[PDB]
Every structure is written in structure tokens, then in C-alpha cells.
Write a protein that binds this ligand. Sequence first.
Ligand SMILES: *[C@@H]1O[C@H](CO)[C@@H](O)[C@H](O)[C@H]1NC(C)=O
Ligand SMILES: *[C@@H]1O[C@H](CO)[C@@H](O)[C@H](O)[C@H]1NC(C)=O
Ligand SMILES: *[C@@H]1O[C@H](CO)[C@@H](O)[C@H](O)[C@H]1NC(C)=O
Ligand SMILES: *[C@@H]1O[C@H](CO)[C@@H](O)[C@H](O)[C@H]1NC(C)=O
Ligand SMILES: *[C@@H]1O[C@H](CO)[C@@H](O)[C@H](O)[C@H]1NC(C)=O
Ligand SMILES: *[C@@H]1O[C@H](CO)[C@@H](O)[C@H](O)[C@H]1NC(C)=O
Ligand SMILES: *[C@@H]1O[C@H](CO)[C@@H](O)[C@H](O)[C@H]1NC(C)=O
Ligand SMILES: *[C@H]1O[C@H](CO)[C@@H](O)[C@H](O)[C@H]1NC(C)=O
Ligand SMILES: [Cl-]
Lengths: 372, 372
Amino acid sequence: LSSLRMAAILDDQTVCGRGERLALALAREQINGIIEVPAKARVEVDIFELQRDSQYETTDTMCQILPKGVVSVLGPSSSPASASTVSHICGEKEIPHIKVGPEETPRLQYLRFASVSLYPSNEDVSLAVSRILKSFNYPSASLICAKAECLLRLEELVRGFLISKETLSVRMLDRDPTPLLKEIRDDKVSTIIIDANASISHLVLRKASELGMTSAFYKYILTTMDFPILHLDGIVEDSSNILGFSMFNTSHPFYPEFVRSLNMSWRENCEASTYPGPALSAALMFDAVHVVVSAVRELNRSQEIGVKPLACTSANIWPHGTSLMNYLRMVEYDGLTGRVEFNSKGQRTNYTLRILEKSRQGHREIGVWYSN
Amino acid sequence: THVLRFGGIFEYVESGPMGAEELAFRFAVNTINRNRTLLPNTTLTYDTQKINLYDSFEASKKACDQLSLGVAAIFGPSHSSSANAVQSICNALGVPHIQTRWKHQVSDNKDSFYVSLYPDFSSLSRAILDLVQFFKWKTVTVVYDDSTGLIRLQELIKAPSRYNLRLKIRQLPADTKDAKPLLKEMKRGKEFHVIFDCSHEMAAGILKQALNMSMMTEYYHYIFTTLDLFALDVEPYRYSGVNMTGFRILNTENTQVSSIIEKWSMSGLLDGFMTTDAALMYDAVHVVSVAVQQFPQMTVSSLQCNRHKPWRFGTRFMSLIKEAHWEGLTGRITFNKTNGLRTDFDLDVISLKEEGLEKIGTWDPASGLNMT
Ligand SMILES: *[C@@H]1O[C@H](CO)[C@@H](O)[C@H](O)[C@H]1NC(C)=O
Ligand SMILES: *[C@@H]1O[C@H](CO)[C@@H](O)[C@H](O)[C@H]1NC(C)=O
Ligand SMILES: *[C@@H]1O[C@H](CO)[C@@H](O)[C@H](O)[C@H]1NC(C)=O
Ligand SMILES: *[C@@H]1O[C@H](CO)[C@@H](O)[C@H](O)[C@H]1NC(C)=O
Ligand SMILES: *[C@@H]1O[C@H](CO)[C@@H](O)[C@H](O)[C@H]1NC(C)=O
Ligand SMILES: *[C@@H]1O[C@H](CO)[C@@H](O)[C@H](O)[C@H]1NC(C)=O
Ligand SMILES: *[C@@H]1O[C@H](CO)[C@@H](O)[C@H](O)[C@H]1NC(C)=O
Ligand SMILES: *[C@H]1O[C@H](CO)[C@@H](O)[C@H](O)[C@H]1NC(C)=O
Ligand SMILES: [Cl-]
């Protein structure tokens, strides 16, 4: 009634962060800046910080949020354990959870469903990586994982292939990738798939470069989603085949301005280090604000929506949460990260992953992956 | 005289008012108070809280109720999501968390106030490799339940990188118990060597359908990860000529143990058996008690969540638990100081002879397999 208030949980640091807090502000100002006749309630994004990926800290945070009377809870973007706690408590109170980051709990299908997710599903990534491999005629491949959780993210991929030196091997880091890379070279395997965070992926590629495995005979596929902000100085060559993904639609009317803003924020904190480019999570946060506002306003056109304080100690729910879930799944939005739509289960669909390729200076798009 | 209070959290059960864990917990506390050699001057008491299965949010509240009440350790719950919620709380307030069931222990997790009596699944997996290499298998097919991830079998998935092995991964339907479609696929592909990663309940039902499809014959050899394999009814199969092999951690050859299994006795599954899940809870109360005898001065404090600071005896008490040694129902018990997990332990190798399931060797991590 009084206003669309939504909460956002940020595990982002303030200094040299990913720009999540600023991205939320930008969407809020862009939307509130558009005056309409008739006029409409102002958008508000209450911000709560998370110091650690702790289920224990997160439960306390949700308990501070419920009394505020919010329409959705966004994030966190990089705390899988906290994100599942947010999903559960959101399900109980029937306040939608807008997922913008990895969540690696199932969750069980037969629990309360109060979610949509702007982040690609594990199955989507495994399909995209398979499709690239299919493009090479399913070479012998080795998988290099930072942590064991890659068997969970890439479950669909791994169980589709026979596991052996000739087909698909799996190797994990202990933390020096040189041993692994030599074993892969001794197998004469050409195609390597790297599942890790930006910095570890950079480390595997640097050690491969030293072993001469970075020529044109090798093809790397990085599953990291921050592939565009991963800068490989003095590693990539004219010969190199290092493929990865990106969700950004650079032809979005607000993209250029979005990057200028995050560029300056980065300078006024980290004059020491150079600006890598926009993190995917910042962009998703921005799109999330638009998705929620869009659904709530469509709901308000055919119902009177009211929010009240809830509590962790009370069995109360938000009566309108269930309707808002319907209107959230019906959203069709064109954001910084491409087309946002959802299927009956709350997963993102009818979107694309741009398949990029590193070159000595910049990238080249060599095709895309769809869902339809 | 003196009294020390444990707290236990147990899931509600369809079977009756008290599940196997809870009955074993009480059974153990009673035995220890009746015993004069062990905890002679201490009398164990406890507070029990129950939660719905899959209710992680209720597990937080109940754990916090117990810490507010004053306890020295918290045993349970069993389901992973709730176990993780309680583990997080126990770590924050510095009170030991005693686990008896396996759960996915996330990599980037840094909780240190917990211990697990379930045999690390990586060690179990190495024991399964040892069986595979012994039987000289070149090809094998791993079947796992959706419920548990691929993650716990990671040692198996990595094996084809180091040994001449070809591994096919097949998933059990999550929506049903019927697996005939899967059995058909295997029978089709001549998949005669198989590893089943699933509970003994699900194994009983799977062998039943395997019998109805002529797959219980001299051609097939089945290896099972369940430690409750011996508690299966193998009458229907013991003449078909099929080979079955697995492990047992219940030290039933020890006479002091057998008598306790007997007191405890007072689908495809037999009766008059104590499950490993119940035996482990019984051993948890004992191994923790060994630590309480080395720390007679402690006194539970009423800790409040999100307010108080860690228990002032916690850090010491948790150290003693991780250093504890106990000879229990499940053989010798010892934890790894580096991760609080039970990575070192003894197994018996059991196999289907014409007479029934019998012992045919042993195994431990240090000296490997020892067939007899
Ligand atoms: C919805 O209800 C009316 C117009 O239908 C208006 O007064 C109110 O501000 C609207 N709320 C929102 C957030 O759109
Ligand atoms: C990437 O993961 C590794 C653990 O595998 C961790 O040590 C490192 O800090 C992570 N990188 C960042 C900057 O998140
Ligand atoms: C950040 O802003 C400055 C402004 O001139 C520009 O030189 C630089 O290229 C920008 N960084 C990126 C990655 O766009
Ligand atoms: C990117 O933006 C342009 C202009 O808004 C739009 O026409 C196009 O459909 C967008 N790309 C995708 C794939 O969503
Ligand atoms: C998917 O997205 C495109 C815009 O990129 C849209 O034109 C198309 O109609 C969508 N497909 C469906 C069936 O929603
Ligand atoms: C009593 O405790 C001792 C020492 O822990 C243990 O070895 C023994 O099994 C117990 N005796 C009986 C009969 O309860
Ligand atoms: C502790 O566990 C690690 C691997 O999980 C293992 O390398 C180490 O040997 C273990 N220590 C003991 C005491 O078993
Ligand atoms: C091998 O088997 C026997 C019987 O279980 C056992 O006594 C022996 O200790 C084992 N060998 C070693 C050194 O582990
Ligand atoms: Cl074979």
C-alpha cells in the first residue's frame, strides 16, 4: 500500500565490491524517476549485510527483515548456504525469494515453493557445456574442479558421459594445478573444462600457459559466470582457445550508463587496482528490482495489495505472497542480463548465454546457447 | 550428587512416538548411569526436542531453546538440512554438536564445534575401490539415489583417472521406488558389475525387482554401500548363484556387543537386528561421556542465541571429544582432529555364500583389504 518495500541481503564487501549496493540504488532511482498518471507508490530497497556464509547469522537477518513488511527478499548472490536458509524461511512466511546467486541445496520438490531465479540453473550450464563439446565432436575431456561441489553443479554433464581417460575424466585441486595438467597431458587429452571461481580459473590457466598447454591444440571451457571480468594478461595467445559464457546484453539502453557508474564507484574505493568490468551479480540485482516491481504492479491492478509486519515467532504469513508468485512467473522483462522469464518451477527460461572466446585483445562471440 | 545435561533433537516418525535414534539415545544414557566404572560420579540427564522431518527452520528454534535451557552437547537431528542448521548454531555459541548420520559437509564451511560418528564416505569409497580392484573389474556401473549427491562418491568418480576403469553413472528415479526401467537399461547394456549407493530399505526392494527380471544369476555381481547389508533377507537369492558383497561396521563377532544387540530386541528386511543408525547414536553418547570424565568441572550455561558469547567450557570440551577413544558397538572409534570426521575405522567384508551372508575378510584404511 504505502510503498513497495523489498529487502536485499548482500554478502558483498563495501571496498572493491561487486557493486551490488549501487546496482540496487540505480534500479530504484530509474524506476522512481519515471512519473506516471496515475502515480504509483515509491520503490524502496532495505539493505541487510551478511559478514559470513552462516546459516546462523542469516536466520537472525531474516528475523530483522520480517517485521519490516516487505514484498520480496533478494539475494544473497554468493553465499549458497545462506541462500537456502533465506529460501526456507521465505517459503514459510510466503514472501517470495528472488534468487540471484548459486544455491546448491536440492531443494526437495515437495516443500513450500516461494522462489524465482534469475541465475542459470545447474542443468542449463551442463547443457551449454555439453553443446559446446558436441560442437567439437565430443573430444576426450578432463574436468578440473576447485571443490567437490562441481559434481553437483555439473551433475547432468558428468552422468551423461562414460567416465574414463578416453571419454571424460574428473580431477580435483588439493593447491597447485601443475600436477593435474601434466597428468592430462600424459593422457594426450586436448579439451579441458575448468569449474572454479575467477581467481582459481586464472591460476589453472597461468600454470597451463607455463607448460605450453595454452597453444591451439588445447580447448578450455570455463563454467565461471564472471568470465568477462576475468582478465588473462600474458596468458592468451593468437593460437589460444579459451571459451566461456556471459549473460550481458550490451545493446540494453542502460548498459553503457550502468558500467560508467560501477566504474567510478570502483575508483573511489580501490584507486590501487584497475576496474575489471561489471560483475554478473550486480546486473542480476538490478534486473531483480525491475522483475519484482513489474509483478507487484500487475498484481495491484487486479487486487488491493497490503503488507503487514511478520515475525519469526509467529505462524502468520503474507496472504498476498501466493498471488505475487503467479505474477512473478508471468513476468517478461528485458534487462541487463538478457530476457527474464520463468517456467512453472521458477527457473529462468527463454534466455541466452553468449558464448565468448578470449583473444589477445578483447573477446569474440562465436555463437550462443538457447533454451527454446 | 552431580548431574550433567545433554540435549537431543529428533525427527518425528510415522512408525511411532519414538524413532530408532531417540530410543538408542535413551538406551545409552540409562546403561551409562547404571555402569559404575564409566562416569562414576556423574549422572547423565537430557532434554528432548522433536521437529518435523525436513523442517530446518524449526531445528534452529529448538536448538536455541536447548542452549537457552543449558546443555553440554546436542545430539541430532538426522536429516541433513536441519543438521546443518543446528551445526551452525552450535558453532556460534561454542557448544559441541554430535552427529550420527552422514550429511553433505560443504567445502567452504569452517564450523569446528562438531563431530560425526558416521564413517567418512570417502574412506568407504576407497574400500569399495579396493573391492573393485581385487575382483579385477574393468567396467562397473554406479547407481545412486537422487536423495544423496554424487559428491559422496567422488572418490569413485576420480578413479578412472588413475586406474584402467570405465565407469557408467545411473540415477535411481526420485519420483518412485520402481526401478525396472533402469534395470532394463543395464540388462540391455550387459552391465554385470554394479555398485548400489542407497539405503538397505531401498536395496531390498531393488533386488526383488532384479529377481523378477532374471538379473539375480551367476552373471551378476553386486556391491552395496549400506552397512546394514547383513540385516537383509537373502533367502530368495542364496541359491541363484548371484554374488553380493558389502561391508559391516557392527562388531557383532564381539560377544559383549552381541549381548547388547540382544537387549535391543526387547519389505525384505529381517527382524531382531539393531540398525547401524541406532548403534551409532548409542556409541555417540558413550564416546562423549569419555570426554566428560576428563573434564569433571564443566557446568552447562544458559546461552541465548544472537546475544551471548560462546560457552566458556566449550572449546576445551570439544577438544577432548575429538581426542576421545572408545571401543563401541561399531568397533574402535576415533576422530580426525583436522575435520572432526571419522575417517579411520574397521570394517568386516561380508558376501553372499550359499548358506547366507557371511564374513570373508576385513578392511581398514592403513593396511587395505584383507580377504580370508
Ligand atoms: C496500487 O493501488 C493504487 C492504484 O491501483 C495506488 O494507490 C497504489 O499506489 C498502487 N500501489 C502500487 C505499489 O502500485
Ligand atoms: C576461490 O576458491 C578458493 C578455494 O578453492 C578460495 O581459497 C578462494 O578464496 C576463492 N576465491 C575468491 C577470491 O573467492
Ligand atoms: C572506466 O572508466 C574509464 C573512463 O575514461 C575508462 O578509461 C575505462 O576504460 C573504464 N573501464 C572499463 C572496463 O570500461
Ligand atoms: C538486447 O537489447 C536489444 C535492444 O533492447 C533487444 O532488441 C534485444 O532483444 C536484446 N537482446 C536479447 C538477446 O535479449
Ligand atoms: C523469447 O524471447 C524473445 C525476445 O528475446 C521473444 O521475442 C520470444 O517471443 C520469446 N519466446 C516466448 C515463446 O516467450
Ligand atoms: C562399564 O564401563 C566400562 C568402562 O567404560 C566398560 O568398559 C564396560 O563395558 C561397562 N560395564 C558394564 C557391564 O556396564
Ligand atoms: C584426516 O582426514 C584427512 C582427509 O579427510 C586425511 O588426509 C588425514 O589422514 C586424516 N587424519 C587422520 C588422523 O586420519
Ligand atoms: C588382516 O586380516 C586379519 C583378520 O581380520 C587381521 O587380524 C589383520 O590385522 C589384518 N591385517 C592387518 C595388518 O590389518
Ligand atoms: Cl569387465
